[PDB]
Design a protein around this ligand. Structure first.
Ligand code: 8QW
Ligand code: CL
Length: 252
């Protein structure tokens, strides 16, 4: 059992395991299920501490706004630890993408509508996630949900081109990454999943004369979204507001 704000939660099991953190499935007093995230601050430098405070502040704040942000029922913070008590998932996306070989199309689209609402609402509060990946979303009553904001602190397929020339972050960056996910969700893999040598996989992402391949398919709209989501020049890439009005999410 765990105590947050003098409330007892019988642990049912581990679900998540970071270096300094855990996620637990958990029964409350009335034996309703919840996920609780534990973070251990014992070893946490001052920025890492501010990053946590910020992510939490912003996750706290976007409760009102969107059911597509992971619900957060309560939290405690202390110099030693953090507990966050949250609605409990079925499974993350990275998980659910690996097993599924064949995806119903009215359900891929429902999930895409869900990703757009979520990322739309963080863009409206000046949050660019800057590292979107399926890990960052969670299925919850068949509804897809964002669980973090890329503020707090090993795949590389979802990385947008402009990211690689950091070496300035516009919400377009997120659109690329949502792209990369949607691509996997229709062509069973990410765009640069074939190019295993990483030094060159980076070179492919930035190269305009390199051509991402979009197999012709039944939903032409969906083919259009992916091409528009994966334009290298971010000012030519399609905005979240644009994507929300695209036939693909609009035509029934
Ligand atoms: C059976 O349940 C399952 C099973 C399987 S599995 C093993 O089948 O793949 C998989 C999943 C579930 N459920 C589940 N439910 C929930 C609810 C909430 C979250 C959740 C919410 C927010 C965060 N936030 C953060 O990690 C960020 C980085 C953060 C936030 C605050 C900080 F101070 C520091 C960092 C992270 C996780 C995760 N899960 N996961
Ligand atoms: Cl509660």
């Amino acid at each position: 059992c765990i105590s947050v704000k003098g409330r007892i939660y019988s642990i049912l099991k581990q679900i998540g395991s970071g270096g300094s953190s855990k996620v637990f499935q958990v029964l409350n007093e009335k034996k309703q299920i919840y996920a609780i995230k534990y973070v251990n601050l014992e070893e946490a430098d001052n920025q890492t501490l501010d990053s946590y405070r910020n992510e939490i502040a912003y996750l706290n704040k976007l409760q009102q706004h969107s059911d597509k942000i992971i619900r957060l029922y309560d939290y405690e913070i202390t110099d030693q630890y953090i507990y966050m008590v949250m609605e409990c998932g079925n499974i993350d996306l990275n998980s659910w993408l690996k097993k599924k070989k064949s995806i119903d199309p009215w359900e891929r689209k429902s999930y895409w509508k869900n990703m757009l609402e979520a990322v739309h609402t963080i863009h409206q509060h000046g949050i660019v996630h800057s590292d979107l990946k399926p890990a960052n979303f969670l299925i919850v009553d068949g509804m897809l949900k964002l669980i973090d904001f890329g503020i707090a602190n090993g795949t590389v397929n979802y990385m947008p081109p402009e990211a690689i020339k950091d070496m300035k972050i516009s919400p377009k960056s997120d659109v690329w990454s949502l792209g990369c996910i949607l691509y996997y969700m229709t062509y069973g893999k990410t765009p640069f999943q074939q190019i295993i040598n990483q030094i060159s996989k980076l070179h492919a992402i930035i190269d305009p004369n390199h051509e991402i391949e979009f197999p012709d398919i039944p939903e032409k709209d969906l083919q259009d979204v992916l091409k528009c989501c994966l334009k290298r020049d971010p000012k030519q890439r399609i905005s979240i507001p644009e994507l929300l009005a695209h036939p693909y999410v609009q035509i029934q």
